[PDB]
Amino acid sequence: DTKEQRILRYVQQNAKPGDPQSVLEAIDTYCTQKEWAMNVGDAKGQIMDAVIREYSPSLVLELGAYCGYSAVRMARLLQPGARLLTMEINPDCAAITQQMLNFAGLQDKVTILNGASQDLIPQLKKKYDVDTLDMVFLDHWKDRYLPDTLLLEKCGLLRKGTVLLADNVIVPGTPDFLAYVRGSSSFECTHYSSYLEYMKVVDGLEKAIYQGPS
Numbered sequence: 488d489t490k491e492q493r494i495l496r497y498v499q500q501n502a503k504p505g506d507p508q509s510v511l512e513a514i515d516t517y518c519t520q521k522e523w524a525m526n527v528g529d530a531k532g533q534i535m536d537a538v539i540r541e542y543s544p545s546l547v548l549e550l551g552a553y554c555g556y557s558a559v560r561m562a563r564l565l566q567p568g569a570r571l572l573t574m575e576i577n578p579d580c581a582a583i584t585q586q587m588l589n590f591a592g593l594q595d596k597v598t599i600l601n602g603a604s605q606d607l608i609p610q611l612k613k614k615y616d617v618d619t620l621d622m623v624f625l626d627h628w629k630d631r632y633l634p635d636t637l638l639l640e641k642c643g644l645l646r647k648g649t650v651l652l653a654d655n656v657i658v659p660g661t662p663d664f665l666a667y668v669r670g671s672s673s674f675e676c677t678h679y680s681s682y683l684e685y686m687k688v689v690d691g692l693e694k695a696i697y698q699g700p701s
């Protein structure tokens with residue numbers, strides 16, 4: 488038995504089928520009052536919402552999924568015909584995420600790819616007919632933020648205006664990724680700070696808008 492499974496069982500008893508908002512609230516309640524989980528929080532959640540709404544991405548790529556919270560949080564805001572592609576290496580988190588999306592009524596919008604992102608990313612063009620992404624959400628293994636950004640560029644998956652949004656850049660922290668995008672002229676960066684009231688600790692998200700190479 489895992490924490491993610493217990494979050495699933497809790498949503499199923501306390502949220503309403505097909506209602507993405509009630510699913511998100513059930514998760515926020517469980518991960519505030521009962522068992523903490525990093526991906527969830529609403530300082531973070533309202534920044535994810537504002538970015539999605541400002542940029543209206545047609546194709547989002549999510550690196551990392553735990554119980555589906557981020558994917559539900561994003562998929563529920565996508566326009567009709569917009570699609571979310573989620574890569575998760577842990578097959579158990581992938582199955583929970585899938586069931587969480589099924590519960591939320593959102594499975595028609597999301598495609599879960601199970602695998603290491605470094606191996607899935609070079610395949611997006613040939614296997615999934617992906618040309619370019621409008622948005623990328625980085626919430627997976629902190630060591631992969633930078634190397635995977637480089638792979639996205641190597642494969643031409645970013646275009647002028649593609650929005651990278653990086654979670655947990657301070658806690659547990661992704662300093663090499665922050666150094667790369669803030670220091671590169673390919674990226675225009677905005678940092679969103681987020682006080683974790685319950686930990687007495689400062690964390691943040693990074694927004695980097697790809698400029699192209701030039």
Ligand SMILES: Cc1nnc(C2CC2)n1-c1ccccc1
Pocket residue numbers: 662663664666667668670
């Ligand atoms: C990559 C990359 N791009 N710019 C930088 C720093 C600002 C100069 N780094 C870097 C250097 C050393 C360790 C980790 C990341």
Ligand code: NA
Pocket residue numbers: 668669670671672673674675676
């Ligand atoms: Na920069």
